[PDB]
Subunit: 333 residues, 4 copies
């Protein structure tokens, strides 16, 4: 008995055909709206990043053997509970690191070349040139990459190709990046010296609100800050207060705290926070780009997410766990 | 020596006044067509930018002119044959910052490919959903075709390679340095047929005039992205417009376009307007078109370097130290 | 006596200090909830505006208070029962300019019926064509329903009559002057079923609370236009939003709405936000909706008259001259 | 009888085909300039709209023509002198809906005086605050100047009286009904100097050509609001633009403007464009300007009535019953 939640409509037929041998229930809605009689039956659930797999929810799933998330991130799942109950958790670590790294650079270039402000001028038939739209060049700037994993290492490499000085912060210091010119530094040194800072760490207890009041105060006046990692890596209240004081040349955010309320229109069922309003206000500024968690959202990513998802599910029904060993977050035993 | 500067932004006037203070210097923020005849007659060296149209008719009114310096890479605004006939020297600035334009080109390419204008429209309407109208493509799955691989175009090709793009190149000079990095030089027709993103980096000449015309556009893939940061007359704007309306393009990025100067200098306050002005204005509002007002070059670094190189050319010339600025000559001695 | 002014715009501070220079005056641009308790305790006359919540809990801390003057028509933000049991007098400004709000209502009705917001979107895209998507209706062919025919609503009904509209009127009190001009007083349910445009002009009370709710919206014609310049809580925003999403309305014009103060005063900078904030922000983007930030009253004459009436009331109260401000009492002697 | 219809909207085609199937009817959705010469020479009756230019040149190609019917109030697009000289009859529709245009006129006035465009800009940026940049004015404090008190202008004056405006009027034909309602006729110069809002409602003729020019605009109050729903050529667009840039106006509202047909019919698709197109496009983007694409008339009742009157005129002419359509004649028999 296989359960899929938060599946877009157009994937519904693809998963029915690809998994025809199995007993499969598919919901376009999230797991909190699935009836308890279907939760009780599920041996394998497949979710995405807005399905909160809390202890409370997972307790209603006594037959659950494996959770597969169609994502790189897995911070939406209570792993400690899964470890203690013997539930396996899989993910898709590398459907397309390029998608997010390319999106990150799209935002950096959009901001540094002031494209949004130019577009506002052009709409007013203002084709003049003046200092309000005077751009900077990447080759004169320092890029600070926080997290040099699959996505961040690509961001670091695009930086180098543009002639940027590249600083890096990670617990794992990569030879390949060092040989190419990147310099690994303390967090405090990266925050102080960078002109463009970009976040590429997972959300964990250690990265929780790591960009906070204190860290933001260490950054250069006029820094550019990009977040394509997770919203809760950044203290949105501190971000907003700093923006209002003019701290930033620009902000690029593809992820932000309480995003799910906007992205899934949960305000139709009573939800809202001050952080939703803060983000909507920022979104209107001419030196801010907010995108709705779509850095991954390319044709290549969606094709790979399908492929890998089908592979993990078939592997598990046959018991061939060796086939999917690179997919485990919580593996055997 | 009597030195005349035209089209100088007011913010640059103090700089040139101090740097050239021991010359007989006259500075106009307006363009050369607006300069009084009594000033034109006296001038021995003029420094212009790309909207100062130095035609035979205008140049005839400057009987003392010895050198034209354009604060720019491009010199298609200058009647060189007339200059050669008359013995007028012409300099330019070949390389203040090729990176400015190459970076801008990629800014536009990524804007279009990640559909950021469309996304921004949705976010404004509180539409934070995801669906196929905003499904992006990846650069690393695409072929870039660079038309012109000079200072600017070669850098664009290298950025393309660094994104994992297949890069096709067209130029009359085939650079071994680009071949060895992975760029493949092809015929024009092959580049047009196979490229998903095409970017133009050739000068405007009689040979590149409407090079991108109805025929060449029809050879492109449906869904191509076309970028122009070279000169507007390299592309037939009437044919580009008709093609856009038939849905030929995934996107257009234009920093330069025919008749741009009417919009950029607001010449419609003096009675000027063309159909291409209205066509570009209509395209500017589409969610898959980016139009910028010839500002690919307009960075802080470019401006610094344009200042420095222009002051070096003027001082060299007044001294007679011509070998010092040999790299700046378009029409050199003698 | 000790006079306390709250929510005074910075631009008005020098005005009031000068007018009331003879008194012991404390002015705040912030609201009453952010005034220090020692100043709350001294206060014998307090002047406020509509976002100052004079709750029982807040009025508890003002043991020396004799008079509350709100610089406004509305007084729903003031606990009148608590004032009555404690002997606190309450004044307001009943008629600084009902024309300001009635003109605003009509600006909204005309905006929507003439589809100006949609036409503007088209024009911004250089779309100057004509088609059924901007085909307008005429007011002279429509029926207006006016709910509340007081100082503001009666003027709205008269504007409608001048436009050749059939005007239906609903109020707890019938007016002969309006009937003689041609308004037809009817029951609420008849007005709701027969009006093409419905506009609200009642005060917020326990009886008007969510007066426009699910049931009553369901009585409206499909395609009705609904205007609210009264008070936000007269309409159930959730039922409104739901009906809107099903296509109930040709248009909506809201100058007031539930939880408006969170947006108007940016209280989200201190943690506040509701789902009604997001519903209104979403509606605000629609091309058949106009949302304004409670500014129907906000004209130059209004502000002038509010300043004048306010010094009048304060000076009359500090003298014993209660007759002079007889018309200003909401809760009078004794 | 050979009947020719030009500039017919596609959705009207079946309707006129059914209405006139007893006749030899040729229907085009394009303008008269794009009708083949063979068809122009057959035509006994022609029905056109305001963008069909019936110049002497075009009419001279129509030897068999007895009657031109324009589906419009306006007839400045027909060379009347020619028609008289040659005995050609000319009808129009004088009163399908003067209320449409008069209501549109007040929709623009109210939009401008209540600063709705600027408020919408603020609301879009989540700025729901109140300050002097959105302080509105009140109509009832202002003087309206109506230039042209015909069918449309007279209604506009009446609405103004309904809003408590002092109404000044200028026309060569005085109407006693308007004086009896409280309108006051004055000289042009006095109307220009004294009015806070001015609205134009004259036909286009030699005498009204550029009526509103540099000199007339200079007589207006600084801060004036100017509206035009008459004809673009009544206003000197260049003078209006120049005055706007000097800060002369609190607002402008234009439903008609010089060279509008290039934008409205997209003639820039065929190489047309003028400076006034670009000036209008620039003004359209300002927050105190509303431009609409000649749609003041464009209401469902207007379209219904234009259809009915056009059918009656055609059916009458073919039957010879000229007495029926006596009210429709611009140029009547002999
Ligand atoms: N915006 C999007 O569309 C989208 C799409 C995919 C992934 N993501 C996010 O991006 C994240 C990164 O993805 P990835 O594929 O690069 O992951 P990764 O695991 O390959 O890289 C993360 C890097 O962060 C480092 N790191 C973790 N904790 C750290 C700490 N506290 N201090 C210093 N370094 C630390 C790791 O050492 C690793 O190098 C995901 O976890 C997910 O949250 C977002
Ligand atoms: N948008 C902007 O702000 C901006 C700024 C600077 C330069 N430009 C434009 O970019 C152009 C290129 O600048 P660059 O510095 O790269 O110049 P470059 O001279 O270094 O490069 C030009 C290249 O074009 C090739 N070429 C010329 N004519 C050709 C033809 N007929 N067919 C095939 N190849 C041809 C040459 O071989 C050369 O490789 C300039 O001439 C200028 O017009 C635009
Ligand atoms: N948007 C704004 O800027 C703004 C400005 C001023 C006033 N207002 C609001 O408009 C309201 C009306 O102002 P006004 O000057 O017309 O006041 P008003 O007292 O003259 O009119 C109120 C009318 O509503 C009627 N009414 C009261 N309760 C009713 C009920 N339960 N059912 C039917 N009718 C009822 C009364 O009989 C009266 O005729 C104010 O109370 C205030 O809430 C808004
Ligand atoms: N914007 C639109 O959608 C649209 C629609 C219909 C009509 N119109 C325009 O509005 C005009 C007026 O329409 P109407 O039905 O009121 O016409 P009308 O003929 O009833 O009124 C015109 C008035 O102008 C006056 N007038 C004419 N020439 C004058 C002059 N030289 N000086 C002073 N007064 C003069 C006449 O005396 C008359 O009172 C039409 O001719 C047309 O151009 C525009």
């Amino acid at each position: 008995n296989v359960l899929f939640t938060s599946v877009p409509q157009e994937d519904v037929p693809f998963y029915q055909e690809a998994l025809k041998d199995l007993s499969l229930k598919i919901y376009t809605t999230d797991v909190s709206k699935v009836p308890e009689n279907e939760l009780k039956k599920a041996e394998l659930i497949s979710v995405f990043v807005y399905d909160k797999l809390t202890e409370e929810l997972l307790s209603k799933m006594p037959r659950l053997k494996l959770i597969h998330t169609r994502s790189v991130g897995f911070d939406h799942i209570d792993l400690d509970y899964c470890k203690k109950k013997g539930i396996l958790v899989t993910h898709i670590p590398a459907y397309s690191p390029e998608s997010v790294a390319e999106h990150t650079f799209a935002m950096i270039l959009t901001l540094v070349k002031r494209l949004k402000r130019i577009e506002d001028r052009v709409k007013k038939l203002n084709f003049s040139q003046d200092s309000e739209i005077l751009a900077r060049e990447l080759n004169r700037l320092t890029l600070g990459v926080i997290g040099t994993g699959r996505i961040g290492s690509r961001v670091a490499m695009y930086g180098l190709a543009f002639g940027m000085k590249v600083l890096c912060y990670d617990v794992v210091k990569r030879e390949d990046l060092k040989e190419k010119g990147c310099v690994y530094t303390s967090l405090d040194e990266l925050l102080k010296e960078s002109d463009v800072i970009s976040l590429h760490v997972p959300y964990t207890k250690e990265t929780h609100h790591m960009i906070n009041e204190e860290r933001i105060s260490l950054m250069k006046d006029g820094v550019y800050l990009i977040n394509t990692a997770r919203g809760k890596v950044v203290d949105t209240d501190a971000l907003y207060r700093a923006y209002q004081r003019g701290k930033f040349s620009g902000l690029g955010l593809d992820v932000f705290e309480d995003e799910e309320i906007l992205i899934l229109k949960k305000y139709t069922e009573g939800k809202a926070t001050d952080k939703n309003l803060k983000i909507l206000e920022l979104a209107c500024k001419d030196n801010v780009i907010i995108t709705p968690h779509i850095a991954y959202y390319t044709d290549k990513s969606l094709e790979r997410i399908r492929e890998e998802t089908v592979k993990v599910v078939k592997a598990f029904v046959k018991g061939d766990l060796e086939q999917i060993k690179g997919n485990f977050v919580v593996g055997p035993s």
